[PDB]
Amino acid sequence: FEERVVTINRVAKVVKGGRRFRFTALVVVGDKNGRVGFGTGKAQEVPEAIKKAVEAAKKDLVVVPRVEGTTPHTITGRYGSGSVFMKPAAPGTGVIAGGPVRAVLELAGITDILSKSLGSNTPINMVRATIDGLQNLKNAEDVAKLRGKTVEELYN
RNA sequence: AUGGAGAGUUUGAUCCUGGCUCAGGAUGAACGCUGGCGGCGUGCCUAAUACAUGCAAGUCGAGCGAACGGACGAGAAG
């Protein structure tokens, strides 16, 4: 699994002595073949935080439906105030996405997509919104099975 | 399906709300520095301010009278 460090944040807890600092890492994990995960890890040192995040991301991996390097249908993934619109694109379009979304889509093995972050730009909520969208993605075969029709009948 | 990227900044730290700021494209542009050439364009946006000088509306003799020019070529031998 490829691993990309989306953000590293120095967080502080106030004690009598003063502020105690730890580092938080947000990491996306993917095989670049329809499985992607995200995890957060916190530690006094950044390498240890990254490592914990990688282990967390591997624990939660989501299967993404892909139609020839794009998504099956347009979707708006929403989590909290985070909102990400993702529209399927033709080959050679490239990944048109910003910041956290790019990492998630690339590691999921999506090479062509149109995306816009419509909500919060906070990295974690953008990632969760993106994952939500991918989770609500559906494939024609499953829709056909659920609706008791052939894929051809689905499209008429 | 031919088409859609975000970032910084309120806190000890946080999530949110929210404004501010930036990365792009464009111009009858101006200014600074610099400057080889060619092709094709563009060039008073302001004082519908005032304007020296030349030029930008004439033509027709197959409408007309008249005037000039007087060829060709009429006479005398100084």
Query: Is any atom of strand B within 7 angstroms of residue A25's beta carbon?
Result: no
Sign of CA dihedral A140, A90, A133, A81: negative
In whole angstroms, what is the distance from residue A28 CA to residue A127 CA? 9
Q: Who contacts A13 (Cβ-Cβ below 8 Å, separation ≥6)?
A: A19, A20, A22
Give chain B positions with protein CB within 7 A: 1-8, 12-17
Which of the 8 DSSP states describes residue A112?
Answer: -
Q: Who contacts A8 (Cβ-Cβ below 8 Å, separation ≥6)?
A: A23, A24, A25, A26, A46, A49, A50
Provide the CA A94 distance to its chain's centre, in angstroms.
Answer: 17
Residue whose tokens read 């006094």: A44
CA of A104 to C1' of B63 (A): 97
CB A128 within 8 A of CB A79: yes
Phi, psi of A138 (to 5 degrees): -130, 150
Three-class secondary structure of residue A90 per DSSP: coil
In whole angstroms, what is the distance from residue A117 CA to residue A129 CA? 9
Three-class secondary structure of residue A46 per DSSP: helix
Query: Is any atom of strand B within 7 angstroms of residue A41's beta carbon?
Result: no
Resolution of the deposited coordinates, in angstroms? 2.2
The closest alpha carbon to A107, from A134, A139, A129, belongs to A134
Which of the 8 DSSP states describes residue A67?
Answer: S
Domain A75-146 maps to which CATH number in 2.60.120.260, 3.90.220.20, 3.30.230.10, 2.60.40.1220?
Answer: 3.30.230.10
Q: How was it solved?
A: cryo-EM
Nearest residue by alpha-carbon distance to C1' of B15: A122
CA of A9 to C1' of B33 (A): 44
Query: Is any atom of strand B within 7 angstroms of residue A119's beta carbon?
Result: yes
CB A41 within 8 A of CB A51: yes
